Design a protein around this nucleic acid. Structure first.
Ligand SMILES: [Mg+2]
Ligand SMILES: [Mg+2]
Length: 196
RNA sequence: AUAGCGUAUAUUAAAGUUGUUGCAGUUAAAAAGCUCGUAGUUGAACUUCUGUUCAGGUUCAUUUCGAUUCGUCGUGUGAAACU
C-alpha cells in the first residue's frame, strides 16, 4: 500500500495501517471503487487527545493529495464512516497545502497566489476538520488581555456526527494552527416567504 | 510713563477680521439656474494572523529586601512595551 502514498519510500506504523485500510476498502466496497482509485495520500499524522474526561482518545489526520480532493469531498461521509470502523480511532481528512512566505519572494515573475497563504490555508484546514458538515457562521472574539478567540456556529442536524469530534478538532487546530476554537450548534435559519 | 515722553506714517500682535492648524456662506457678505465632463484633488475589503521558549536591557509597581544619605545604587519578585 505504498501505492496510496506519493513518496512510497517510507511509511510509519500509522501510515502502514491507513494504507492497508484503503486497500481493504478498495477491495470490499464497489461503492468506493472509483473514489479510492483516485485518492493518493501525502502524509498521515497521529494525535493524542487527553481531556478532563480521563479519556485518552487517539485521532488520525490523513492528508489527501490535492488532485484527489474533489473526489474525497464527494466520498467524505461513506469514507470517514468506514475508516472509523477499520481502526478504533476517529479520522479526519485535509488537502496537502503549501504556504508561500510573505517577504521571501523566490522568483521575480511569480506572484504568490492567495490560495496559499498562512491564513487562507489554516482556515481551509478548519473547513476540512468539519468535513462532512459546514460552518453556518464564524466569529472572532477579542478578550481583554489581547488573546484572540474563535467560535463557530454549526448546523443542528449534524450534531450526531460532530459531537465527540469537537475536542479532537480543537486539539488538532490548537496544534497546527495555533488557534483557540469554540463551537455552537444553532438551527440553520432559512428566511422563507412560505404561502400557507 | 520717566532722562526721556508726545505726534505722523509702513509694518507685528491684537485677527478664529485670510482660517493648514482655524473662520464664515437659510435670514447678517456670501452654494453658480441646471446636468455631462478632461486636467486637479479623492479613493472599499483580503496575504506570516499566531503560540511557545531563551536572553538582553528599559520602563512600571511595590505588604521584596537591602546599601548607604539627604538620595542614588544594588536586589528581588512579578507586571508590561519592547529589542
Ligand atoms: Mg436682505
Ligand atoms: Mg485602501
Amino acid at each position: 500500500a505504498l501505492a496510496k502514498f506519493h513518496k512510497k519510500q517510507s511509511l510509519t506504523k500509522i501510515e502502514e495501517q491507513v494504507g492497508s485500510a484503503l486497500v481493504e476498502l478498495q477491495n470490499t466496497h464497489p461503492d468506493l471503487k472509483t473514489s479510492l482509485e483516485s485518492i493518493i495520500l501525502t502524509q498521515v499524522k497521529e494525535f493524542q487527545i487527553n481531556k478532563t474526561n480521563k479519556k485518552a482518545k487517539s485521532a488520525v489526520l490523513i492528508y489527501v493529495h490535492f488532485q484527489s480532493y474533489r473526489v474525497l469531498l464527494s466520498a467524505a461521509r461513506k469514507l470517514i464512516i468506514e475508516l472509523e470502523k477499520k481502526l478504533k480511532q476517529i479520522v479526519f481528512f485535509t488537502a496537502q497545502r503549501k504556504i508561500e512566505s510573505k517577504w521571501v519572494k523566490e522568483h521575480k515573475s511569480q506572484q504568490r497566489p492567495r490560495s496559499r497563504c498562512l491564513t487562507y490555508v489554516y482556515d481551509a484546514l478548519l473547513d476540512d476538520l468539519l468535513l462532512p458538515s459546514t460552518l453556518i457562521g464564524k466569529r472572532i472574539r477579542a478578550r481583554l488581555d489581547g488573546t484572540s478567540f474563535y467560535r463557530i456556529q454549526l448546523d443542528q442536524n449534524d450534531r450526531d456526527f460532530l459531537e465527540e469530534k469537537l475536542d479532537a478538532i480543537t486539539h488538532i487546530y490548537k496544534t497546527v494552527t495555533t488557534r483557540e476554537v469554540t463551537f455552537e450548534f444553532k438551527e440553520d435559519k432559512t428566511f422563507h416567504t412560505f404561502k400557507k
